[PDB]
Amino acid sequence: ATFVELSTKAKMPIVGLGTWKSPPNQVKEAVKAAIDAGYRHIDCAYAYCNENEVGEAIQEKIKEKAVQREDLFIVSKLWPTCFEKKLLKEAFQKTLTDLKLDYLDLYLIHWPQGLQPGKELFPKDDQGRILTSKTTFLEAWEGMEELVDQGLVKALGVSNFNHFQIERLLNKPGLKHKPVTNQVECHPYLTQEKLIQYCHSKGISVTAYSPLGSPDRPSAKPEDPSLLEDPKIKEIAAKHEKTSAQVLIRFHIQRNVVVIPKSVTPSRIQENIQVFDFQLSDEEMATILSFNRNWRACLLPETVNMEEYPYDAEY
Ligand SMILES: NC(=O)C1=CN([C@@H]2O[C@H](COP(=O)(O)OP(=O)(O)OC[C@H]3O[C@@H](n4cnc5c(N)ncnc54)[C@H](OP(=O)(O)O)[C@@H]3O)[C@@H](O)[C@H]2O)C=CC1
Ligand SMILES: O=C(O)Cc1nn(Cc2nc3cc(C(F)(F)F)ccc3s2)c(=O)c2ccccc12
């Protein structure tokens, strides 16, 4: 299907356009090319430093009458340096006014660990240690619930949360709006079977990020795992006359998981959403699921000892 039904009954387009690393100079035309290619969901974030330009694109396509606002599903996230309530309101406003929108369809806690407030996204002492803060995501959640009550955000969600962190949120006393999504890394080398089963059991959808392995991530060592070059994935793509990137995106669609490939190249943006005219067989899905390597593409070793570091839990 072309969407994943959320618990609120809102339909989240299953293929969205990722924007991390897209330069401010190139993201406006890339979002316009994606909307022309049928994309109706754009993943954004205050931390990506390009929301203003993404806003310019949406505003132009709505002004040109190519689509209405309700046809789109815009997602942004709250960076952990802004969990405190006063800072949360200021950050959300910066994200909403940069995007030039009346409301967001989905706002997510970006990472579960609160970081020191300030101008930097990664505050650090002199020895390179990333500075944390004690304000939790539960406190930040209350500020986010207010935005929903103010009609500025339709729904809330979390990102990079393990099941213990989602349980704390679902068990929060006085919880007013449940999370409708948990955005995490997911691809054939990190299949997330237990986390996806847990989220679906709670009525929480999952959005898979870095579906192509994030080849353009900072400091990627060329010898690390390459999903786009894996011959085993190329073989299955050839059986369907599709590319490896199209198989990597169709994989999530067949698990009822939203996926958000990133690209500032119009031909690839088109190629990445031409995944609705074929289906991976049951045997092909089992083979791809067997490629799991519990491999995450972008790690920060300085975050491993943090209190909310999310990767060492079972799921
Ligand atoms: N919540 C979180 O913590 C995180 C969320 N995300 C989100 O997920 C999105 C996607 O993940 P991301 O890490 O960016 O990496 P992706 O796995 O989407 O890969 C992006 C890279 O793949 C290239 N590419 C895209 N399509 C193709 C294709 N068909 N063939 C070959 N190369 C292709 C792009 O090149 P080019 O652009 O030049 O076309 C770019 O270099 C992010 O942009 C962001 O929105 C990502 C990480 C973390
Ligand atoms: O954030 C994006 O969307 C992409 C993203 N991912 N990563 C890897 C990260 N790993 C983390 C781990 C924690 C932790 F919670 F574990 F502490 C906290 C924060 C991070 S950022 C980055 O290093 C990064 C830097 C700038 C802009 C975007 C990103």
Domains, in order of start, for the chain:
1-315 (3.20.20.100)
Does residue 133 contact residue 114 with C-beta atoms inside 8 Å?
yes
> Is any ligand 2 atom within 6 A of the Cβ of residue 49?
no
Residue 66 Cα, ligand 2 centroid: separation in angstroms? 34
Resolution in A: 1.7
234 annotated to a ligand binding site: yes
Phi–psi pair at 212, nearest 5 degrees: -100, 10
End-to-end CA distance of the chain: 27
Residue 213 Cα, ligand 2 centroid: separation in angstroms? 15
Q: β-strand 11-13 against 3-5: which pairing, if any?
A: antiparallel
The technique is: X-ray
CA–CA gap between residue 241 and residue 116 (Å, rounded) = 49
Q: Which ligand 2 atom is at minimum distance from the Cα of 309? A: 16
> Is any ligand 2 atom within 6 A of the Cβ of residue 79?
no
